[PDB]
Design a protein around this motif. Sequence first.
Motif, short mmCIF file in Angstrom:
data_model
loop_
_atom_site.label_atom_id
_atom_site.label_comp_id
_atom_site.label_asym_id
_atom_site.label_seq_id
_atom_site.Cartn_x
_atom_site.Cartn_y
_atom_site.Cartn_z
N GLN A 161 159.08 78.66 -19.91
CA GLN A 161 159.37 77.57 -18.49
C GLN A 161 159.59 76.40 -19.36
O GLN A 161 160.69 75.64 -18.44
N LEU A 162 159.25 75.88 -20.46
CA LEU A 162 159.75 74.61 -20.79
C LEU A 162 161.33 74.73 -21.15
O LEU A 162 162.36 73.76 -21.18
N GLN A 163 161.56 75.74 -21.83
CA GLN A 163 163.17 76.14 -22.34
C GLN A 163 164.08 76.25 -21.13
O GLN A 163 165.27 75.70 -21.13
N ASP A 164 163.57 76.74 -20.00
CA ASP A 164 164.17 76.76 -18.86
C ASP A 164 164.72 75.33 -18.31
O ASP A 164 165.73 75.17 -17.62
N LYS A 165 164.04 74.37 -18.54
CA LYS A 165 164.42 72.97 -18.01
C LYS A 165 165.37 72.24 -19.08
O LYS A 165 165.57 71.15 -18.89
N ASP A 166 166.02 73.13 -20.18
CA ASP A 166 166.71 72.76 -21.07
C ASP A 166 168.19 73.71 -20.76
O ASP A 166 168.39 74.36 -21.74
N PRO A 167 168.50 73.48 -19.50
CA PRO A 167 169.80 74.40 -19.41
C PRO A 167 170.91 74.32 -20.32
O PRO A 167 171.74 75.43 -20.56
N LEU B 75 143.30 84.57 -29.39
CA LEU B 75 144.55 83.99 -30.03
C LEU B 75 145.59 84.97 -29.41
O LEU B 75 146.70 84.18 -29.09
N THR B 76 145.50 86.23 -29.13
CA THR B 76 146.86 87.02 -28.65
C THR B 76 146.92 86.69 -27.36
O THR B 76 148.10 86.66 -26.64
N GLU B 77 145.92 86.28 -26.46
CA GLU B 77 146.01 85.98 -25.31
C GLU B 77 146.58 84.51 -25.06
O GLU B 77 147.64 84.42 -24.10
N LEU B 78 146.20 83.49 -25.87
CA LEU B 78 146.69 82.22 -26.03
C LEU B 78 148.12 82.36 -26.25
O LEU B 78 149.19 81.59 -25.62
N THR B 79 148.71 83.10 -27.25
CA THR B 79 150.01 83.38 -27.81
C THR B 79 150.73 83.70 -26.58
O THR B 79 152.01 83.56 -26.02
N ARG B 80 150.11 84.73 -25.59
CA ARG B 80 150.71 85.22 -24.25
C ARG B 80 151.03 84.00 -23.24
O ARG B 80 152.18 84.28 -22.91
N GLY C 33 158.88 69.01 -18.05
CA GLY C 33 157.90 69.65 -18.72
C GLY C 33 156.39 69.49 -18.31
O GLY C 33 155.47 70.19 -18.46
N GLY C 34 156.35 68.03 -18.03
CA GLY C 34 155.04 67.57 -17.63
C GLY C 34 154.06 68.49 -16.71
O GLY C 34 153.14 68.77 -16.86
N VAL C 35 155.10 68.79 -15.65
CA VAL C 35 154.37 69.74 -14.53
C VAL C 35 153.74 70.99 -14.91
O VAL C 35 152.76 71.51 -14.79
N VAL C 36 154.61 71.85 -15.98
CA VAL C 36 154.22 72.85 -16.52
C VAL C 36 153.03 72.96 -17.56
O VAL C 36 152.14 73.51 -17.52
N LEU C 37 153.09 71.86 -18.46
CA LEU C 37 151.98 71.55 -19.32
C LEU C 37 150.67 71.03 -18.62
O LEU C 37 149.61 71.49 -19.30
N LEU D 260 150.96 80.83 -24.07
CA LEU D 260 152.19 79.89 -24.79
C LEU D 260 153.28 80.44 -24.66
O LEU D 260 154.58 79.61 -24.62
N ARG D 261 153.59 81.65 -24.89
CA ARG D 261 154.97 82.14 -24.67
C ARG D 261 155.80 81.93 -23.34
O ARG D 261 156.86 81.53 -23.23
N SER D 262 154.91 82.08 -22.31
CA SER D 262 155.09 82.08 -20.89
C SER D 262 155.66 80.45 -20.80
O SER D 262 156.62 79.93 -20.20
N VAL D 263 154.70 79.42 -21.31
CA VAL D 263 154.64 78.13 -21.22
C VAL D 263 156.16 77.69 -22.02
O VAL D 263 157.10 77.16 -21.39
#
Length: 121
Positions: free
Chosen positions: A24-30, A11-16, A106-110, A18-21
């Motif tokens: 990356q998604l939030q950068d697409k909302d400048p 779970l901790t690693e999933l969280t790690r 976001g599609g690319v990232v996901l 998903l945090r990076s994901v």
Amino acid sequence: SMEQVAMELRLTELTRLLRSVLDQLQDKDPARIFAQPVSLKEVPDYLDHIKHPMDFATMRKRLEAQGYKNLHEFEEDFDLIIDNCMKYNARDTVFYRAAVRLRDQGGVVLRQARREVDSIG
């Protein structure tokens, strides 16, 4: 148990991941259109239109509490951000347009996130 610990490390690693994901998604909302909850002081009728509001700060609170069990749950929240916007706002608005671009980018990232999640287990 040792199993509960192994599970907690997963779970901790999933969280790690998903945090990076999320970053990356939030950068697409400048413009930061999706950064915070729609203000109920400023849009007092919002909940009459949108029954499950979502935004990136709310996702981040859930993430940091390790509240996403799998990528599907995370994607559900991201899709709410986009779909809520596309309903509330008309097609000819900067808000609608921002959601379309976030969805598309976001599609690319996901896509790679799902491969990584399956790959690493």
